[PDB]
């Protein structure tokens, strides 16, 4: 029976015209991201299930020496996976994006395991031609580079898209909102990201990396809106701003993030400036110390646009002259903008800074709701063969 079993596998694998059609349409594009909440609990088997499938298929293609097929098979997988991430828009941006980051990482872990195996284990080098060995080692290595170049790509594509969703909500909910977007919408945006990376068994270093990136962006785009705002920067406004940023701080605190304050300093020190005393020269000196992230050209621009209330007394010309006096000295040392250039990419892939998932044997599994005739037949065949 083992003869007939192996024979059926070959015919299924050799025809990468049917298989490429099933994978791309049914598995990669026909992907169904499970509910991204810890209402229901997801095991790893339900998160990286397409990756586990693509591994089994690729493993058999490598076992029957179908190098010609496995090459064209994966060369479409990469193109299709990246095609999906780029086409991601709307309410699926966060859960689907994370979903593929987990799979690409799962796929990348296997190729690392394969390449590490073929170079360390001699049974491979001893059991094949010097030509064949130099072909596989070059085949798997090229594949590994393509996979880390895929994770790096789909991360930036996804992260640049996250920043686009924020900017629509971030500015209006931080600069304008006062306790049409609110801080509740912003914190909901982060709650979504948090729950996704927890439900999909994502390493918490990636979660730290994503939030850190987004926080510095919100810090930048909101500050650049404030420093151009005129007849707007009042004491009451500065107090309202501090509360909004406080809610962001308290969210980071309660969600395993300790560097959130460091990412929001430009907003924090802006709020502090709009509240602290600015009457005498003595006050400005203390102000320069508190606002250590700001520059004299920024302090001058922020102070001069301060909204003095009906009752409040304006800032003396003696102070303004003293501030501009400091700006004079600062500019001479550099022998020059007031805005903060937001980090819009390219970004370093956080997954590339964590050890690859130590690959262990995979359970032959495929969801019942999926409709992949040839692909399922393969997995079922290897299951019987393993027992034999």
């Amino acid at each position: 029976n083992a003869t007939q079993i192996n024979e059926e596998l070959y015919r299924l694998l050799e025809d990468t015209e049917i298989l490429n059609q099933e994978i791309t349409e049914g598995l990669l594009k026909g992907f169904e991201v499970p509910d991204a909440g810890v209402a229901i609990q997801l095991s790893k088997r339900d998160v990286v299930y397409p990756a586990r499938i693509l591994i089994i298929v690729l493993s058999e293609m490598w076992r029957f020496g179908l190098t010609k097929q496995s090459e064209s098979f994966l060369a479409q997988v990469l193109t299709t996976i990246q095609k999906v991430v780029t086409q991601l828009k709307g309410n699926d941006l966060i859960p689907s994006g994370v979903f593929w980051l987990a799979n690409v990482r799962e796929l990348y872990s296997f190729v690392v395991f394969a390449l590490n195996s073929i170079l360390t284990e001699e049974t491979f080098k001893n059991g094949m031609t010097d030509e064949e060995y130099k072909e596989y080692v070059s085949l798997v290595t090229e594949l590994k580079d393509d996979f880390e170049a895929l994770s790096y790509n789909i991360y930036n594509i996804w992260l640049k898209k996250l920043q686009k969703q924020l900017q629509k909500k971030a500015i209006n909910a931080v600069v304008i909102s006062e306790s049409e977007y609110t801080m509740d919408d912003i914190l909901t945006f982060f709650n979504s990201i948090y729950w996704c990376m927890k439900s999909f068994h994502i390493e918490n270093e990636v979660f730290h990396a994503v939030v850190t990136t987004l926080l510095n962006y919100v810090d930048a785009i909101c500050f650049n809106e404030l420093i151009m705002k005129r007849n707007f920067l009042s004491w009451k406004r500065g107090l309202q701003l501090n509360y909004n940023v406080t809610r962001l701080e308290e969210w980071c605190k309660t969600h395993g993030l300790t560097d959130g304050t460091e990412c929001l300093q430009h907003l924090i020190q802006t709020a502090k400036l709009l509240q602290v005393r600015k009457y005498t020269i003595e006050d400005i000196d203390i102000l320069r110390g508190i606002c250590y992230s700001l520059t004299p050209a920024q302090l001058q621009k922020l102070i001069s646009q301060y909204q003095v209330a009906d009752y409040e007394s304006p800032i003396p010309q003696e102070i303004l002259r003293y501030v501009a006096d400091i700006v004079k000295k600062e500019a001479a040392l550099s022998s020059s903008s007031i805005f903060i250039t937001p980090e819009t990419g390219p970004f370093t892939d956080p997954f590339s800074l964590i050890k690859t998932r130590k690959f262990d044997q995979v359970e032959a599994y495929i969801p019942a709701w999926l409709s992949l005739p040839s692909t399922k037949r393969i997995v079922d065949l290897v299951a019987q063969q393993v027992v034999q």
């Binding site: 591994i55 493993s59 490598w62 076992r63 195996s117 064949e132 995979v362």
Partner: peptide, 9 residues
């Protein structure tokens, strides 16, 4: 000859 890995349970 091929390239055989042991990856299933």
């Amino acid at each position: 000859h091929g390239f055989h890995l042991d990856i299933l349970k």
